[PDB]
Design a protein around this ligand. Structure first.
Ligand SMILES: Nc1ncnc2c1ncn2[C@@H]1O[C@H](COP(=O)(O)OP(=O)(O)OP(O)(O)=S)[C@@H](O)[C@H]1O
Ligand SMILES: Nc1ncnc2c1ncn2[C@@H]1O[C@H](COP(=O)(O)OP(=O)(O)OP(O)(O)=S)[C@@H](O)[C@H]1O
Ligand SMILES: Nc1ncnc2c1ncn2[C@@H]1O[C@H](COP(=O)(O)OP(=O)(O)OP(O)(O)=S)[C@@H](O)[C@H]1O
Ligand SMILES: Nc1ncnc2c1ncn2[C@@H]1O[C@H](COP(=O)(O)OP(=O)(O)O)[C@@H](O)[C@H]1O
Ligand SMILES: [Mg+2]
Ligand SMILES: [Mg+2]
Ligand SMILES: [Mg+2]
Lengths: 329, 546, 325, 174, 348
DNA sequence: GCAGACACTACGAGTACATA
């Protein structure tokens, strides 16, 4: 009886437990009924449930005894070169479809090849999947899982039926989090769950991780908004007001002081970019100032995505918004 | 005007409103059996077409072997070193100190012809070893040991064997090591060896250059080559002006074989008088020259002297020459290491900034082509030397040196990484986990060296105080915690010095910084002796506990 | 009998008459077959246009089922096609006779752009010397990845994108064979979202028929997740006609309600920009900014900030367009 | 290599002209009794681009598919050469005419050419274009910057339009 | 041992600062179903100390019995690459950035063999093992993409604690799979309290002025503050208030490099500064820290209307340095751009 | 009948380069 984290304890074991992805859930339930399953391409933001949906669909199609004979999962944690596609994928695709479910449930007459994280697969290795998917489509199906669909070549995009996984809405995510908190015998306030579904930004794995960590930190009493705010790394609004006051002052020394205070406090630069953008798009600045401040925010977010230094990007963004705030003064 | 104040009547429109609230409307809707190079090939010494200094130097070098080969006492700048090598005497085993004559130069000059003619002139028998042989080190050793370590079958009156090794630049490094092993074996070498290469700066011939009689071939004199081509055309019954032959000589880049082959194709027997336009045509006689690095750097950094004055012709010439040079990374390193030492007229540093932008563009192209396996991004970095030519064109005479900063930086970085990995390997794993090597280098190295050097007076241990002994014990403990110790070093000046066994001073210290007071010899010797007796008493304490 | 197949493979043009678009090219290849003067073919074009199906129908028309295994040597990117394969199996297939029935043989090199340049240079004299014995068909999506020697040795046919007027009867055939209830706007949505791709037309048709049971405009744009053109017109109107805050609120509410992605919004706004009679400098600025925003979405970025930058790129040019007058 | 080229008489062949291909095409036509017109043979020459193999292949394809050689039968199976429109696209990009350049780009896009082929033809035209040297260098740098994005995975009509807009800006930013 | 290692706390109840976070981390790992952890913050804040305190809370005192394990990993190019791991009977510490660009092979092969095997003893040890990945911000994106499925498949028998400085270099698939634990730098009062308790445990007296100057000069790095305090006690045993503090050599070398930049704006001075930057890069100083030190020194010599453009140029060229592979090109480009801007500002 | 020698192919290892 070992404890398990809630992202694996409450993983969807069937298609009916998958939330908010209604079109692909309807397609997979029709494939459970016996319809013709095509080749699938799942893409979207992280934590939306691309892996759990296809794993639940495969374990409902084949069951426990035929999951090892009909499902081949290849991801970025194992080597996927051109020779792995030429040998391991192609010889699996040429195997016979045999074996029946012992519980009396119907079994589809194909295998499923799950190529999770197809962004990391090279363009040469993706080119060898084309006639493998076309010729062996009578006996196997291919599901490509990725986050950026531009990192998969256009023949494989055309060969697969694309399904985009949307970020989960606040109603569905709040309902799932309240169901998980109900099944775990913990209590969370309405403001706490509202701030949780605002913080998680459609990432249900992040929401479940934050809920489990707030349950462990709280210990079993009421989960308020303060524990959620402290556990999410949300920068307080006084720091944002001090940043904008240092920008309105027009001095670079106070700008360096507030940037060094935010860096030394360990606040992530992506969270600061999000909060500065939220203040900027919801104030009484002019349209031109808001325009170039938001464009600088997009440039800073792009540079942070490429692993640039947080201090230099934040001081460049602060210099730009300081110039914009002191230009009209 | 794309913007209409009034809305359109028939076409579809999309409204545009500014911040002040005024609407704007946009529209939504055996003469015939042999080659001429073989027919006119030189068979005597008097008809050679090379530089006379190189022929005389090779003949004098081969005549220095007559003491040990023929058993007769009597045989019958770059020039100053070769004249000194011919008059520096002989080794005590009555042989020249340079036992290999190395011939280098561009093709079509007559290096093989000079080697064979000079070998047959001095009474030797030419043993030819070329690139069509196996060139494996076992076959290389067997061939050289057959050619050089035995006498002749004919006995008295038999010709000695002079080993001529053509195309030594393409030989593997192990074959050169075999050649150097049979060169410096003290199985003693008694016969001369001649090596011919096209590129003296090959990586496999680095140790061969320091031991050989280096004879660099200059390009052939155009007057002598024009006279020889005139004699060849007169022998074949063909008429040609000196001007058209000089045009052919400057077209073929002073290549004897290419000029004679071009004349053999162009003459035939349909016509006799060769025309200037046939040589000036690019259909016959033009070959792709492999340009050197320094010629490319000169062509880039210096404008041609005064048609050819158009900028597009210089653009295409610089692009094609930099493409035809090869070794693109060396060209980029030379451009990076030579463009700041010029007499730059751009005092605003904009040309330097856009040249560095071009260098970063080349670096990003190399990274993207080596990341996404998309090597069609490598057709753009050929335009980096022509960008440097456009930006830094001058009529002066720049001094171009070889690029060495990036390779020395990489070598020093590898040495410092090896020194860091040697330093962290001695630390205990309990204290290795508490800090990364990067944080230990940035934070805990210079301050650690400030800890390890206290203000210690040159006084013996029996006259120390309680605080001095406690500080010394703490110093020895902190030195033993990081597995550091002092050992003696031998100096050519005759004094002994103590130094750290991992030399972590060069990890910390910098050249332009002010000097700090170091620890003396007596204090460092006392510290080393205290470390040794602390190790002894630590072993004794470990024996006492267990 | 019924088979569990995707509709891109269940409905494949096994004969040359079942293909829809390239009538001149297919007529010329049919007259090549009927006269027995088939040359070395080079079929190139965008994906999903019918290059593999054409040569498979030609191979089934030329050769019978009792001689197909010894007459056609089909190699693709899933097989090893190195220079030892060109010197080995391909050269031995090209240089030998047949076994059962006398005739010319066929070597189909599908996805020939993925071959190395050494193999393509070794392929030249195999094609040229054995023209009377065998024929070579090269299929690629990129003509720049095939060397000009092989482009000279093979006559080239461009299998261009399928026009939406010609994709309608094949989609209607698939619909009447699969018993699909589809309206007119569903067909228009299929042929609009396909963009000259028959594969993804059948993929969107099958996914929409399984997801909803009927194929209309709303079901296609819901299953695919593509924004409606009215949504793009509303986004352009909000971006060009009001201030930053109200446009941000309206576009954010539309993206939250409809579940839109910024890539397709950027694509449709880019298509809308060239239709709007912008000034030249405004058009250049909008194209550069939209290309920058499209490039920024290929990494781990925040889509809300890029949406704000998309609004910003038009909020900058509002005053320039109005002051142009 | 240079030592092999020194050992041989290096002969350099140039591209065949229109009349030189036309004489051999007339010989093949008179051997094969092919009916033809003058503009059809001019279209065959235009599609040949100095290649006799492509001229013979296009002539045989047009004769087998249609039985007559006029311009419409040649251009129904063969195609116009790619850089002959990329040249005026680059010419419109030099004069900062973004509308005509996008018209040529969209015409090349609707014919099914991949962005890699289009940017390869763009670089091929810009390598030997007749303009300023510094403008050509920054054009080539912008082409390489866009080609890195195309090879990275993002390759749409918006990226090519942004490349054309950047090439038009490089003129207006001295 | 030095003062950085002699008085490091062992458990979560003995931490001098972030005591509320210490109690929260104690309550987090009590049940055993805690998720993967992302301990992030500035360097010297105390992240590794809290990670070892979490390991002390989970297992017994046997996590302090560390040993060096040498692993030989085979590249796809069949080149043997040597890496070193610190391991105990309960956990493992891996730094995959020591293998360089082949860290993806380390993640795919070394971590998967650890995760695929359960523990030998299940009574003295717990039901799961902990893998410490240090400096995951220095990992390439390929290694982070290889990391993500191992973090989900074997998270009931193997837990991961990832340590980094900036979470911007961590990809959002990895950041979605783990709980982010923020460890801020200690304040001036916290560093003064730590240094005062260290000096009281050493039998010494530390003034408040000297402790405040040591806290201010360390830039809120407690490791560097403790090293500077021990260096000040080897240099001078009476702790004076105005006692000089020793400095690191690369920092003053960076300051003299920036002074050489602002002294003259010529291509010859640019060549000399390139030589100085080569000397900085050969000593294994990271180029982003070189950019940060340059911007920290160049903005002291700039006027008030020039600092924003220099900061934006420094950020732009540091981003281009992160995109590129040769740091000296982008460093010399930033220095040349600053020289051009400074000459234009001085001449006008 | 069993030990030594001969060449045989498969396999391990090192290196270059990939554009127009
Ligand atoms: N739609 C969903 N319904 C129910 N649980 C979900 C859903 N999405 C995520 N979860 C939970 O979060 C965990 C993560 O789901 P995943 O399938 O790994 O998401 P993902 O799409 O794979 O993210 P990436 O792109 O692989 S990083 C699951 O194991 C569930 O516990
Ligand atoms: N004086 C001469 N008159 C006419 N032909 C000559 C004369 N000297 C040499 N040649 C010919 O020019 C060529 C010289 O090339 P070789 O000496 O054989 O080789 P090489 O000059 O060392 O150049 P490489 O590097 O081997 S290509 C040969 O074909 C000779 O026959
Ligand atoms: N012209 C067409 N007529 C009818 N169906 C077509 C046509 N083109 C494609 N299809 C359908 O799309 C499927 C795939 O067509 P393919 O021949 O594989 O396209 P393709 O031209 O080979 O694309 P690539 O380059 O190989 S990815 C076929 O099985 C048909 O169902
Ligand atoms: N609570 C604490 N009390 C006393 N000293 C501490 C405390 N936390 C950290 N330190 C000291 O500060 C230094 C921080 O280094 P480390 O723990 O490796 O954190 P990081 O990984 O952030 O550098 C350690 O050497 C440790 O001795
Ligand atoms: Mg996944
Ligand atoms: Mg020779
Ligand atoms: Mg195909």
């Amino acid at each position: 009886a070992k404890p398990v984290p809630w992202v694996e304890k409450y993983r969807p074991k069937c298609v009916d437990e998958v939330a908010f992805q209604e079109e692909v859930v309807a397609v997979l339930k029709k494939s459970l009924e016996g319809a013709d399953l095509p080749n699938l391409l799942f893409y979207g933001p992280p934590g939306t449930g691309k892996t759990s949906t296809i794993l639940a669909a495969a374990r409902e199609l084949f069951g426990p005894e035929l999951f090892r004979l009909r499902v081949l999962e290849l991801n970025a944690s194992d080597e996927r070169g051109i020779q792995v596609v030429r040998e391991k994928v192609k010889n699996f695709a040429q195997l016979t479809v045999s074996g029946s479910r012992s519980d009396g449930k119907p079994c589809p007459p194909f295998k499923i090849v799950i190529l999770d994280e197809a962004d990391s697969m090279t363009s040469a290795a993706q080119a060898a999947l084309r006639r493998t998917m076309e010729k062996e489509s009578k006996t196997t199906r291919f599901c490509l899982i990725c986050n950026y669909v531009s990192r998969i070549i256009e023949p494989l995009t055309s060969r697969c039926s694309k399904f985009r996984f949307k970020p989960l809405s606040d109603k569905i995510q709040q309902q799932r989090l309240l169901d998980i908190a109900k099944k775990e015998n913990v209590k969370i306030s309405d403001e706490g769950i509202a701030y949780l579904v605002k913080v998680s930004e459609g990432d249900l794995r992040k929401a479940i991780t934050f809920l489990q960590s707030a349950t462990r930190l709280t210990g079993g009493k009421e989960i308020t908004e303060k524990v959620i705010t402290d556990i999410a790394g949300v920068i307080p609004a006084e720091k944002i007001d001090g940043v904008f006051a240092a920008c309105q002052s027009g001095s670079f020394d106070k700008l360096e002081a507030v940037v060094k205070d935010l860096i030394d406090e360990g606040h992530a630069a992506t969270q600061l970019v999000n909060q500065l953008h939220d203040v900027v798009v919801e104030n009484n600045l002019s349209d031109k100032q808001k325009s170039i401040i938001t464009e600088k925010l997009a440039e800073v977010d792009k540079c942070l995505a490429d692993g640039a230094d947080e201090h230099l990007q934040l001081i460049s963004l602060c210099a730009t918004v300081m110039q914009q705030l002191s230009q009209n003064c | 005007n794309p913007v209409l104040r009034r809305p359109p009547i028939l076409e579809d429109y999309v409204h545009v409103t500014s911040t002040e609230g005024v609407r704007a409307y946009l529209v939504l809707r055996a003469s015939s059996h042999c080659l001429w190079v073989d027919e006119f090939a030189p068979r005597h010494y008097t008809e050679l077409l090379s530089d006379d200094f190189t022929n005389r130097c090779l003949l004098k070098w081969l005549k220095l072997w007559d003491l040990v080969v023929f058993g007769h006492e009597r045989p019958s700048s770059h020039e100053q070193v070769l004249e000194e090598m011919l008059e520096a005497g002989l080794d005590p085993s009555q042989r020249p100190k340079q036992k290999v004559a190395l011939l280098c130069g561009p093709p079509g000059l007559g290096k093989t012809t000079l080697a064979h003619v000079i070998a047959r002139h001095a009474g030797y028998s030419v043993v030819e070893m070329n690139a069509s042989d196996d060139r494996s080190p076992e076959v290389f050793r067997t061939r050289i040991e057959a050619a050089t370590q035995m006498e002749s079958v004919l006995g008295a009156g038999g010709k000695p064997n002079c080993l001529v090794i053509d195309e030594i630049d393409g030989a593997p490094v192990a074959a050169i090591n075999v050649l150097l092993s049979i060169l410096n074996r003290k199985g003693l070498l008694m016969r001369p060896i001649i090596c011919i290469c096209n590129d003296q700066f090959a990586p496999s011939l680095r140790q061969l250059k320091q031991q050989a009689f280096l004879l660099h071939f200059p390009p052939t004199l155009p007057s002598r080559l024009v006279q020889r081509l005139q004699e060849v055309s007169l022998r074949q019954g063909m008429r040609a002006d000196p001007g058209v032959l000089a045009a052919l000589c400057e077209k073929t880049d002073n290549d004897i074989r290419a000029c004679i082959n071009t004349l053999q194709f162009l003459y035939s027997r349909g016509q006799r008088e060769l025309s200037v336009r046939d040589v000036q045509a690019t259909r016959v006689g033009l070959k792709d020259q492999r340009r050197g690095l320094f010629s490319v750097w000169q062509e880039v950094f210096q404008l041609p002297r005064a048609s050819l004055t158009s900028a597009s012709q210089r653009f295409y010439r610089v692009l094609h020459a930099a493409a035809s040079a090869g070794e693109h990374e060396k060209v980029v390193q030379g451009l990076f290491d030579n463009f700041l030492r010029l007499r730059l007229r751009d005092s605003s540093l904009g040309a330097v900034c856009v040249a560095l932008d071009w260098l970063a563009f080349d670096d990003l192209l190399a990274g993207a082509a080596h990341h996404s396996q998309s090597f069609q991004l490598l057709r753009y970095p050929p335009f980096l030397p022509v960008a440097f030519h456009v930006l830094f064109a001058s009529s002066h005479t720049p001094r171009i040196t070889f690029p060495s900063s990036q390779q020395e930086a990489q070598n020093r970085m590898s040495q410092m990484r090896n020194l860091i990995q040697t330093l962290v390997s001695g630390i205990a794993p309990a204290t290795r986990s508490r800090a990364t090597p990067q944080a230990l280098l940035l934070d805990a190295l210079c301050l650690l060296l400030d800890i390890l050097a206290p203000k210690l007076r040159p006084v013996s241990t029996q006259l120390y105080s309680t605080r001095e002994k406690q500080q010394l014990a703490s110093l020895v403990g902190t030195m033993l915690a990081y597995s550091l110790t002092y050992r003696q070093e031998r100096t050519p000046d005759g004094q002994y010095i103590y130094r750290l066994e991992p030399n972590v001073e060069e990890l910390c210290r910098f050249p332009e910084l002010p000097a700090r007071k170091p620890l003396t010899y007596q204090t460092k010797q006392l510290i080393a002796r205290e470390i040794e007796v602390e190790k002894m008493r630590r072993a004794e304490a470990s024996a006492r506990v267990e | 009998k019924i088979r569990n197949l995707p509709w891109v493979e269940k409905y494949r043009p096994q004969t040359l008459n079942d293909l829809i678009s390239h009538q001149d090219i297919l007529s010329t290849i049919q007259k090549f077959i009927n006269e027995d003067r088939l040359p070395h073919l080079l079929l190139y074009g965008p994906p999903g246009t019918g290059k593999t199906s054409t040569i498979l129908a030609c191979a089934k028309q030329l050769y019978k089922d009792k001689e197909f295994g010894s007459m056609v040597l089909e190699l693709n990117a899933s097989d090893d096609r190195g220079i030892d394969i060109i010197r080995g199996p391909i050269l031995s297939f090209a240089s030998t006779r047949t076994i059962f029935k006398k005739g010319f043989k066929l070597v189909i090199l599908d996805e020939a752009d993925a071959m190395t340049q050494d193999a393509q240079n070794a392929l030249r004299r195999v094609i040229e010397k054995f023209t009377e014995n065998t024929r070579f068909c090269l299929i690629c999506n990129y003509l720049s990845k095939i060397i000009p020697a092989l482009q000279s040795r093979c006559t080239r046919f461009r299998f261009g994108p399928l026009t939406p007027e010609l994709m309608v009867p094949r989609l209607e055939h698939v619909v009447e064979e699969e018993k699909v209830d589809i309206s007119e706007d569903g067909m228009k949505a299929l042929v609009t979202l396909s963009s000259g791709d028959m594969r993804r037309a059948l993929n969107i048709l099958q996914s929409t028929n399984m997801a909803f049971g009927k194929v209309t405009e709303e079901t296609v744009y819901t299953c695919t997740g593509h924004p409606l053109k009215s949504d793009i017109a509303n986004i352009l109107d909000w971006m060009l006609n009001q201030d930053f805050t109200t446009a941000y609120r309206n576009i954010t509410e539309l993206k939250t309600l409809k579940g839109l992605a910024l890539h397709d919004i950027l694509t449709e706004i880019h298509l809308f920009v060239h239709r709007v009679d912008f000034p030249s400098s405004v058009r250049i600025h909008l194209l550069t900014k939209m290309a920058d925003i499209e490039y920024r979405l290929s990494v781990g970025t925040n889509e809300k900030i890029q949406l704000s930058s998309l609004i910003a790129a038009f909020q900058v040019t509002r005053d320039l367009i109005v002051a142009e007058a | 290599i240079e030592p092999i080229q020194s050992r041989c008489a290096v002969l350099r062949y140039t591209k065949l002209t229109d009349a030189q291909i036309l004489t051999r095409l007339m010989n093949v036509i008179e051997k094969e009794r092919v009916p033809y017109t003058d503009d059809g043979l001019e279209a065959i020459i235009f599609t040949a681009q100095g290649d006799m193999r492509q001229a013979l292949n296009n002539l045989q394809s047009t004769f087998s598919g249609f039985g007559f050689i006029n311009s419409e039968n040649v251009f129904k199976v063969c195609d116009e050469p790619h850089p002959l429109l990329v040249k005026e696209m680059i010419q419109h990009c030099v004069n900062a005419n973004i509308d005509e350049a996008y018209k040529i780009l969209a015409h090349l896009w609707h014919l099914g050419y991949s962005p890699e082929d289009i940017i390869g033809n763009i670089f091929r035209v810009c390598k030997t274009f007749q303009m300023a040297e510094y403008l050509k260098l920054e054009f080539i740098k912008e082409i390489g910057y866009t080609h890195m994005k195309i090879a990275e995975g993002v390759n749409s009509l918006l990226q090519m339009a942004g490349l054309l807009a950047r090439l038009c800006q490089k003129t207006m930013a001295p | 041992s030095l003062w950085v290692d002699k008085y490091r706390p062992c458990s979560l109840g003995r931490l001098d600062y972030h005591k509320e976070q210490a109690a929260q981390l104690r309550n987090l790992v009590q049940c055993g179903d805690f998720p993967h952890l992302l301990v992030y913050g500035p360097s010297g804040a105390g992240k590794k100390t809290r990670i070892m305190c979490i390991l002390r809370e989970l297992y017994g005192v046997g996590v302090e019995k560390l040993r060096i394990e040498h692993q030989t990993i085979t590249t796809p190019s069949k080149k043997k690459i040597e890496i070193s791991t610190i391991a105990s009977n309960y956990h493992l510490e891996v730094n995959p950035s020591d293998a360089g660009n082949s860290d993806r092979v380390v993640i795919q092969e070394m971590l998967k063999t650890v995760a695929q095997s359960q523990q030998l003893e299940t009574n003295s040890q717990r039901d799961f093992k902990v893998v410490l990945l240090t400096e995951v911000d220095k990992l390439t994106k390929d290694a982070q993409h290889a990391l993500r499925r191992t973090m989900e498949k074997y998270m009931s028998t193997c837990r991961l604690i990832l340590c980094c400085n900036s979470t911007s270099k961590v990809i959002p698939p990895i950041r979605s799979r783990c709980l982010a634990v923020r460890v801020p730098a200690p304040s001036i009062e916290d560093i003064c309290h730590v240094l005062s308790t260290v000096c009281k445990k050493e039998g010494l007296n530390l003034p408040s002025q000297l402790a405040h100057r040591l806290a201010e000069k360390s830039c809120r790095n407690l490791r560097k503050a403790l090293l500077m305090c021990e260096a000040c006690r080897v240099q001078q045993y009476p702790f004076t208030a105005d006692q000089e503090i020793p400095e690191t050599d690369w920092e003053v070398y960076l300051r003299e490099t920036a002074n050489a930049i602002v002294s003259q704006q010529t291509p010859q001075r640019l060549l000399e500064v390139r030589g100085r930057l080569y000397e900085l890069l050969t000593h294994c100083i990271p180029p982003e820290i070189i950019m940060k030190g340059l911007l920290s020194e160049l903005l002291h010599n700039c006027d008030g209307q020039l600092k924003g453009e220099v900061a934006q140029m420094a950020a732009y060229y540091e981003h281009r340095l992160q995109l590129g592979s040769k740091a000296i090109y982008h460093l010399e480009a930033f220095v040349a751009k600053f020289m051009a801007l400074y000459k234009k500002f001085m001449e006008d």
